[PDB]
Amino acid sequence: QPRPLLSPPETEEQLLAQAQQLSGYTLGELAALVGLVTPENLKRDKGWIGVLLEIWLGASAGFAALGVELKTIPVDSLGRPLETTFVCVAPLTGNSGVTWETSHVRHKLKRVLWIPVEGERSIPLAQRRVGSPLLWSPNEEEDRQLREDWEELMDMIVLGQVERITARHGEYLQIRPKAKALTEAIGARGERILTLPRGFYLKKNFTSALLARHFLIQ
């Protein structure tokens, strides 16, 4: 029977052991154990699940230390990703001299704690359960492909071909509009263009394969 961490995890094994303690419990049960009330619609408190997990993952403090990025991931009653996963915002101006090494994507992705949560809309927020957590780092072959995708997409962005981008660019990573708003960028001629703000995303089949791995034998 779970209890929130009296202090932040001092190691990633401590952080994972706790995350695993919340598997099977619903957001409503986890909030009731901490004196919180689950909204009836997340749209009113857009960042509610994040605060709750942070309270449980140790000290609200009224993971940057451990070097592990926490990422919730919406899944179905079977634990498979419902959608595309957002990594970070893709800036269309002022990203020169930036590399894969000093990129926020690689940073945020170097070591991740995936926390599956049933994200199916029709399910009352309070009845959505936490799945099985998974600490993950891209292997050398995945990290080369992530670099290939990041360099390609940033190349297009800076070369003035952001509108030329589709889901066909990048095997793992993807750039999709972050969704009214328009952000400034560079065109095919180098001219100024207004466009939909963008973000780096990970394909569904990618987060899908990684959560499913440990199940397979032979």
PDB file of C-alpha atoms in Angstrom:
ATOM      1  CA  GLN A   1       0.000   0.000   0.000  1.00  0.00           C
ATOM      2  CA  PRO A   2       1.815   3.112  -1.407  1.00  0.00           C
ATOM      3  CA  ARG A   3       2.957   6.227   0.432  1.00  0.00           C
ATOM      4  CA  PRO A   4       4.552   9.357  -1.086  1.00  0.00           C
ATOM      5  CA  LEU A   5       8.318   9.736  -0.852  1.00  0.00           C
ATOM      6  CA  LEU A   6       9.247  11.900   2.134  1.00  0.00           C
ATOM      7  CA  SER A   7      12.143  13.239   0.020  1.00  0.00           C
ATOM      8  CA  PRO A   8      13.263  13.153  -3.626  1.00  0.00           C
ATOM      9  CA  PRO A   9      14.874   9.914  -4.814  1.00  0.00           C
ATOM     10  CA  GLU A  10      18.631   9.866  -4.246  1.00  0.00           C
ATOM     11  CA  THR A  11      19.063   7.331  -7.052  1.00  0.00           C
ATOM     12  CA  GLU A  12      17.178   6.128 -10.110  1.00  0.00           C
ATOM     13  CA  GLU A  13      16.535   2.700  -8.591  1.00  0.00           C
ATOM     14  CA  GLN A  14      14.793   4.420  -5.676  1.00  0.00           C
ATOM     15  CA  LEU A  15      12.788   6.484  -8.146  1.00  0.00           C
ATOM     16  CA  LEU A  16      11.754   3.449 -10.173  1.00  0.00           C
ATOM     17  CA  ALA A  17      10.876   1.324  -7.123  1.00  0.00           C
ATOM     18  CA  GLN A  18       8.427   4.066  -6.092  1.00  0.00           C
ATOM     19  CA  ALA A  19       6.960   4.607  -9.545  1.00  0.00           C
ATOM     20  CA  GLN A  20       6.279   0.868  -9.652  1.00  0.00           C
ATOM     21  CA  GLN A  21       4.406   1.249  -6.337  1.00  0.00           C
ATOM     22  CA  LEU A  22       1.711   3.274  -8.129  1.00  0.00           C
ATOM     23  CA  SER A  23       0.995   0.696 -10.863  1.00  0.00           C
ATOM     24  CA  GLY A  24      -2.609  -0.443 -10.910  1.00  0.00           C
ATOM     25  CA  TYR A  25      -3.877   2.473  -8.851  1.00  0.00           C
ATOM     26  CA  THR A  26      -6.126   5.059 -10.436  1.00  0.00           C
ATOM     27  CA  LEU A  27      -5.504   8.792 -10.484  1.00  0.00           C
ATOM     28  CA  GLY A  28      -8.459   9.165  -8.154  1.00  0.00           C
ATOM     29  CA  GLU A  29      -7.027   6.695  -5.604  1.00  0.00           C
ATOM     30  CA  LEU A  30      -3.616   8.299  -5.703  1.00  0.00           C
ATOM     31  CA  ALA A  31      -5.119  11.751  -5.164  1.00  0.00           C
ATOM     32  CA  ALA A  32      -7.346  10.572  -2.311  1.00  0.00           C
ATOM     33  CA  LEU A  33      -4.257   9.211  -0.531  1.00  0.00           C
ATOM     34  CA  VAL A  34      -2.740  12.679  -0.615  1.00  0.00           C
ATOM     35  CA  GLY A  35      -5.717  14.905   0.167  1.00  0.00           C
ATOM     36  CA  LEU A  36      -6.226  15.977  -3.441  1.00  0.00           C
ATOM     37  CA  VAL A  37      -9.464  15.963  -5.406  1.00  0.00           C
ATOM     38  CA  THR A  38      -9.344  14.806  -8.997  1.00  0.00           C
ATOM     39  CA  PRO A  39     -11.014  17.245 -11.399  1.00  0.00           C
ATOM     40  CA  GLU A  40     -13.880  15.816 -13.448  1.00  0.00           C
ATOM     41  CA  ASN A  41     -12.165  17.100 -16.601  1.00  0.00           C
ATOM     42  CA  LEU A  42      -8.406  17.584 -17.020  1.00  0.00           C
ATOM     43  CA  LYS A  43      -9.003  20.565 -19.326  1.00  0.00           C
ATOM     44  CA  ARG A  44      -9.706  22.714 -16.270  1.00  0.00           C
ATOM     45  CA  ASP A  45      -6.424  21.770 -14.589  1.00  0.00           C
ATOM     46  CA  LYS A  46      -4.262  20.890 -17.579  1.00  0.00           C
ATOM     47  CA  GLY A  47      -1.214  19.964 -15.528  1.00  0.00           C
ATOM     48  CA  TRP A  48      -2.866  18.051 -12.702  1.00  0.00           C
ATOM     49  CA  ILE A  49      -1.424  14.569 -13.316  1.00  0.00           C
ATOM     50  CA  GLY A  50       2.090  15.962 -13.340  1.00  0.00           C
ATOM     51  CA  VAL A  51       1.804  17.566  -9.904  1.00  0.00           C
ATOM     52  CA  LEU A  52       0.290  14.425  -8.393  1.00  0.00           C
ATOM     53  CA  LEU A  53       3.073  12.182  -9.690  1.00  0.00           C
ATOM     54  CA  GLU A  54       5.632  14.705  -8.481  1.00  0.00           C
ATOM     55  CA  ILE A  55       4.142  14.686  -4.992  1.00  0.00           C
ATOM     56  CA  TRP A  56       4.444  10.887  -5.019  1.00  0.00           C
ATOM     57  CA  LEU A  57       7.827  10.768  -6.705  1.00  0.00           C
ATOM     58  CA  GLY A  58       9.098  12.467  -3.643  1.00  0.00           C
ATOM     59  CA  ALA A  59       9.140  15.908  -2.174  1.00  0.00           C
ATOM     60  CA  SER A  60       6.678  18.219  -3.816  1.00  0.00           C
ATOM     61  CA  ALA A  61       9.416  20.590  -2.646  1.00  0.00           C
ATOM     62  CA  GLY A  62       7.363  23.800  -2.689  1.00  0.00           C
ATOM     63  CA  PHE A  63      14.926  14.199 -11.040  1.00  0.00           C
ATOM     64  CA  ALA A  64      17.150  16.786 -12.691  1.00  0.00           C
ATOM     65  CA  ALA A  65      19.627  15.663 -10.042  1.00  0.00           C
ATOM     66  CA  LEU A  66      19.334  11.974 -10.842  1.00  0.00           C
ATOM     67  CA  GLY A  67      19.652  12.827 -14.531  1.00  0.00           C
ATOM     68  CA  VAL A  68      16.405  11.153 -15.529  1.00  0.00           C
ATOM     69  CA  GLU A  69      13.623  12.899 -17.396  1.00  0.00           C
ATOM     70  CA  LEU A  70      10.138  11.993 -16.224  1.00  0.00           C
ATOM     71  CA  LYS A  71       7.644  11.420 -19.059  1.00  0.00           C
ATOM     72  CA  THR A  72       4.029  10.379 -18.644  1.00  0.00           C
ATOM     73  CA  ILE A  73       2.647   8.455 -21.603  1.00  0.00           C
ATOM     74  CA  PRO A  74      -1.027   7.889 -22.422  1.00  0.00           C
ATOM     75  CA  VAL A  75      -1.862   4.277 -23.149  1.00  0.00           C
ATOM     76  CA  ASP A  76      -4.853   1.999 -23.633  1.00  0.00           C
ATOM     77  CA  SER A  77      -6.114  -0.670 -21.221  1.00  0.00           C
ATOM     78  CA  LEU A  78      -3.389  -2.854 -22.751  1.00  0.00           C
ATOM     79  CA  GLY A  79      -0.461  -0.509 -22.096  1.00  0.00           C
ATOM     80  CA  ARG A  80       0.158   0.521 -25.697  1.00  0.00           C
ATOM     81  CA  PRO A  81       0.619   4.205 -26.608  1.00  0.00           C
ATOM     82  CA  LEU A  82      -2.516   5.998 -27.737  1.00  0.00           C
ATOM     83  CA  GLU A  83      -0.630   8.719 -29.540  1.00  0.00           C
ATOM     84  CA  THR A  84       2.536  10.552 -30.502  1.00  0.00           C
ATOM     85  CA  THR A  85       4.848  11.597 -27.638  1.00  0.00           C
ATOM     86  CA  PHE A  86       5.994  15.213 -27.294  1.00  0.00           C
ATOM     87  CA  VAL A  87       9.661  15.817 -26.500  1.00  0.00           C
ATOM     88  CA  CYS A  88      10.231  19.571 -26.650  1.00  0.00           C
ATOM     89  CA  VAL A  89       9.456  22.729 -28.628  1.00  0.00           C
ATOM     90  CA  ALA A  90      11.117  23.127 -32.001  1.00  0.00           C
ATOM     91  CA  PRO A  91      12.324  26.751 -32.404  1.00  0.00           C
ATOM     92  CA  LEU A  92      12.369  28.077 -35.941  1.00  0.00           C
ATOM     93  CA  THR A  93      14.762  30.988 -35.383  1.00  0.00           C
ATOM     94  CA  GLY A  94      17.938  31.361 -33.334  1.00  0.00           C
ATOM     95  CA  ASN A  95      19.007  27.700 -33.311  1.00  0.00           C
ATOM     96  CA  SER A  96      22.309  28.101 -35.176  1.00  0.00           C
ATOM     97  CA  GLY A  97      25.488  26.643 -33.696  1.00  0.00           C
ATOM     98  CA  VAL A  98      23.242  24.186 -31.869  1.00  0.00           C
ATOM     99  CA  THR A  99      24.251  20.530 -32.182  1.00  0.00           C
ATOM    100  CA  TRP A 100      23.001  17.077 -31.295  1.00  0.00           C
ATOM    101  CA  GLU A 101      25.347  17.107 -28.280  1.00  0.00           C
ATOM    102  CA  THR A 102      24.038  20.418 -26.944  1.00  0.00           C
ATOM    103  CA  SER A 103      20.435  19.799 -28.043  1.00  0.00           C
ATOM    104  CA  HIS A 104      17.480  19.681 -25.637  1.00  0.00           C
ATOM    105  CA  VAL A 105      15.995  16.676 -27.421  1.00  0.00           C
ATOM    106  CA  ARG A 106      19.074  14.514 -26.785  1.00  0.00           C
ATOM    107  CA  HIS A 107      19.317  15.925 -23.297  1.00  0.00           C
ATOM    108  CA  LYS A 108      15.719  15.222 -22.373  1.00  0.00           C
ATOM    109  CA  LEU A 109      16.003  11.808 -24.090  1.00  0.00           C
ATOM    110  CA  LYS A 110      19.372  10.639 -22.754  1.00  0.00           C
ATOM    111  CA  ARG A 111      17.662   8.949 -19.797  1.00  0.00           C
ATOM    112  CA  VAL A 112      13.882   8.703 -19.455  1.00  0.00           C
ATOM    113  CA  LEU A 113      11.414   7.288 -16.889  1.00  0.00           C
ATOM    114  CA  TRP A 114       8.271   6.384 -18.844  1.00  0.00           C
ATOM    115  CA  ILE A 115       5.181   6.421 -16.674  1.00  0.00           C
ATOM    116  CA  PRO A 116       2.255   4.901 -18.596  1.00  0.00           C
ATOM    117  CA  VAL A 117      -1.205   6.171 -17.738  1.00  0.00           C
ATOM    118  CA  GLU A 118      -4.529   5.327 -19.354  1.00  0.00           C
ATOM    119  CA  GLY A 119      -5.125   8.458 -21.452  1.00  0.00           C
ATOM    120  CA  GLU A 120      -8.361   7.473 -23.179  1.00  0.00           C
ATOM    121  CA  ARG A 121     -10.627  10.568 -23.141  1.00  0.00           C
ATOM    122  CA  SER A 122     -13.988   8.927 -22.381  1.00  0.00           C
ATOM    123  CA  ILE A 123     -12.545   7.428 -19.169  1.00  0.00           C
ATOM    124  CA  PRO A 124     -13.345   9.654 -16.196  1.00  0.00           C
ATOM    125  CA  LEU A 125      -9.983  11.079 -15.140  1.00  0.00           C
ATOM    126  CA  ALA A 126     -10.272   9.608 -11.619  1.00  0.00           C
ATOM    127  CA  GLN A 127     -10.733   6.097 -12.973  1.00  0.00           C
ATOM    128  CA  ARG A 128      -7.598   6.096 -15.132  1.00  0.00           C
ATOM    129  CA  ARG A 129      -4.922   3.760 -13.846  1.00  0.00           C
ATOM    130  CA  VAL A 130      -1.170   3.953 -13.760  1.00  0.00           C
ATOM    131  CA  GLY A 131       0.600   1.256 -15.753  1.00  0.00           C
ATOM    132  CA  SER A 132       4.124  -0.123 -15.404  1.00  0.00           C
ATOM    133  CA  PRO A 133       7.045   2.359 -15.251  1.00  0.00           C
ATOM    134  CA  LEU A 134      10.145   1.851 -17.394  1.00  0.00           C
ATOM    135  CA  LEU A 135      13.554   3.549 -17.145  1.00  0.00           C
ATOM    136  CA  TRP A 136      14.991   3.894 -20.633  1.00  0.00           C
ATOM    137  CA  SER A 137      18.007   5.184 -22.572  1.00  0.00           C
ATOM    138  CA  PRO A 138      18.491   4.883 -26.341  1.00  0.00           C
ATOM    139  CA  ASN A 139      21.074   2.257 -27.259  1.00  0.00           C
ATOM    140  CA  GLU A 140      23.890   3.212 -29.640  1.00  0.00           C
ATOM    141  CA  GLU A 141      21.851   2.217 -32.701  1.00  0.00           C
ATOM    142  CA  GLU A 142      18.759   4.108 -31.613  1.00  0.00           C
ATOM    143  CA  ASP A 143      20.834   7.120 -30.615  1.00  0.00           C
ATOM    144  CA  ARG A 144      22.467   7.253 -34.060  1.00  0.00           C
ATOM    145  CA  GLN A 145      19.031   7.235 -35.688  1.00  0.00           C
ATOM    146  CA  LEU A 146      17.771   9.878 -33.288  1.00  0.00           C
ATOM    147  CA  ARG A 147      20.771  12.026 -34.227  1.00  0.00           C
ATOM    148  CA  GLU A 148      20.106  11.387 -37.906  1.00  0.00           C
ATOM    149  CA  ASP A 149      16.517  12.535 -37.509  1.00  0.00           C
ATOM    150  CA  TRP A 150      17.339  15.592 -35.349  1.00  0.00           C
ATOM    151  CA  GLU A 151      20.050  16.793 -37.726  1.00  0.00           C
ATOM    152  CA  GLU A 152      17.842  16.279 -40.769  1.00  0.00           C
ATOM    153  CA  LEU A 153      14.816  18.125 -39.333  1.00  0.00           C
ATOM    154  CA  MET A 154      16.927  20.976 -37.896  1.00  0.00           C
ATOM    155  CA  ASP A 155      18.678  21.195 -41.267  1.00  0.00           C
ATOM    156  CA  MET A 156      15.305  21.705 -42.959  1.00  0.00           C
ATOM    157  CA  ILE A 157      14.213  24.205 -40.311  1.00  0.00           C
ATOM    158  CA  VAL A 158      17.291  26.425 -40.742  1.00  0.00           C
ATOM    159  CA  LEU A 159      17.571  25.947 -44.535  1.00  0.00           C
ATOM    160  CA  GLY A 160      14.144  27.563 -44.721  1.00  0.00           C
ATOM    161  CA  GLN A 161      12.128  24.425 -45.508  1.00  0.00           C
ATOM    162  CA  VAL A 162      10.025  23.939 -42.376  1.00  0.00           C
ATOM    163  CA  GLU A 163       6.810  23.668 -44.429  1.00  0.00           C
ATOM    164  CA  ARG A 164       8.432  20.911 -46.473  1.00  0.00           C
ATOM    165  CA  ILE A 165       8.431  18.755 -43.325  1.00  0.00           C
ATOM    166  CA  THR A 166       6.005  15.835 -42.975  1.00  0.00           C
ATOM    167  CA  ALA A 167       5.920  12.581 -40.997  1.00  0.00           C
ATOM    168  CA  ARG A 168       8.202  11.127 -43.681  1.00  0.00           C
ATOM    169  CA  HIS A 169      11.272  12.895 -42.297  1.00  0.00           C
ATOM    170  CA  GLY A 170      12.804  11.041 -39.365  1.00  0.00           C
ATOM    171  CA  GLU A 171      12.513   7.329 -38.552  1.00  0.00           C
ATOM    172  CA  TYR A 172      12.069   7.854 -34.787  1.00  0.00           C
ATOM    173  CA  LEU A 173      11.784  11.591 -34.181  1.00  0.00           C
ATOM    174  CA  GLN A 174       9.167  13.730 -35.927  1.00  0.00           C
ATOM    175  CA  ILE A 175       8.314  17.405 -36.159  1.00  0.00           C
ATOM    176  CA  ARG A 176       4.603  18.230 -35.962  1.00  0.00           C
ATOM    177  CA  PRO A 177       2.706  21.446 -35.292  1.00  0.00           C
ATOM    178  CA  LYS A 178       2.167  21.995 -31.554  1.00  0.00           C
ATOM    179  CA  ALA A 179      -1.561  21.217 -31.832  1.00  0.00           C
ATOM    180  CA  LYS A 180      -4.500  30.107 -33.761  1.00  0.00           C
ATOM    181  CA  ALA A 181      -0.892  30.943 -32.895  1.00  0.00           C
ATOM    182  CA  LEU A 182       1.794  31.644 -35.471  1.00  0.00           C
ATOM    183  CA  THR A 183       5.517  31.794 -34.914  1.00  0.00           C
ATOM    184  CA  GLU A 184       8.095  33.517 -37.100  1.00  0.00           C
ATOM    185  CA  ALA A 185      10.412  31.477 -39.332  1.00  0.00           C
ATOM    186  CA  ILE A 186      12.568  31.476 -42.495  1.00  0.00           C
ATOM    187  CA  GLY A 187      11.357  30.680 -46.019  1.00  0.00           C
ATOM    188  CA  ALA A 188      12.670  29.001 -49.173  1.00  0.00           C
ATOM    189  CA  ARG A 189      14.159  32.336 -50.215  1.00  0.00           C
ATOM    190  CA  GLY A 190      15.343  33.186 -46.732  1.00  0.00           C
ATOM    191  CA  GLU A 191      12.405  35.555 -46.401  1.00  0.00           C
ATOM    192  CA  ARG A 192      10.233  35.824 -43.294  1.00  0.00           C
ATOM    193  CA  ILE A 193       7.297  33.479 -42.916  1.00  0.00           C
ATOM    194  CA  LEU A 194       4.604  33.029 -40.276  1.00  0.00           C
ATOM    195  CA  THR A 195       3.860  29.453 -39.363  1.00  0.00           C
ATOM    196  CA  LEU A 196       2.360  27.093 -36.800  1.00  0.00           C
ATOM    197  CA  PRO A 197       4.657  26.644 -33.816  1.00  0.00           C
ATOM    198  CA  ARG A 198       6.291  23.205 -33.920  1.00  0.00           C
ATOM    199  CA  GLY A 199       7.550  20.507 -31.615  1.00  0.00           C
ATOM    200  CA  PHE A 200       9.781  17.460 -31.711  1.00  0.00           C
ATOM    201  CA  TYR A 201       7.728  14.281 -31.241  1.00  0.00           C
ATOM    202  CA  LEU A 202       8.490  10.566 -31.076  1.00  0.00           C
ATOM    203  CA  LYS A 203       6.469   8.324 -33.376  1.00  0.00           C
ATOM    204  CA  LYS A 204       3.815   6.093 -31.833  1.00  0.00           C
ATOM    205  CA  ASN A 205       5.383   2.886 -33.140  1.00  0.00           C
ATOM    206  CA  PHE A 206       8.632   3.905 -31.423  1.00  0.00           C
ATOM    207  CA  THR A 207       7.243   4.390 -27.920  1.00  0.00           C
ATOM    208  CA  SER A 208       5.099   1.396 -28.703  1.00  0.00           C
ATOM    209  CA  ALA A 209       7.987  -0.950 -29.425  1.00  0.00           C
ATOM    210  CA  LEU A 210       9.953   0.174 -26.396  1.00  0.00           C
ATOM    211  CA  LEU A 211       7.168  -0.448 -23.865  1.00  0.00           C
ATOM    212  CA  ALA A 212       6.453  -3.841 -25.394  1.00  0.00           C
ATOM    213  CA  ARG A 213      10.013  -5.192 -25.509  1.00  0.00           C
ATOM    214  CA  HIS A 214      10.394  -7.101 -22.211  1.00  0.00           C
ATOM    215  CA  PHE A 215       7.311  -9.208 -22.983  1.00  0.00           C
ATOM    216  CA  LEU A 216       8.765 -11.057 -25.981  1.00  0.00           C
ATOM    217  CA  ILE A 217      10.651 -14.355 -25.723  1.00  0.00           C
ATOM    218  CA  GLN A 218      11.517 -16.957 -28.402  1.00  0.00           C
TER     219      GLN A 218
END
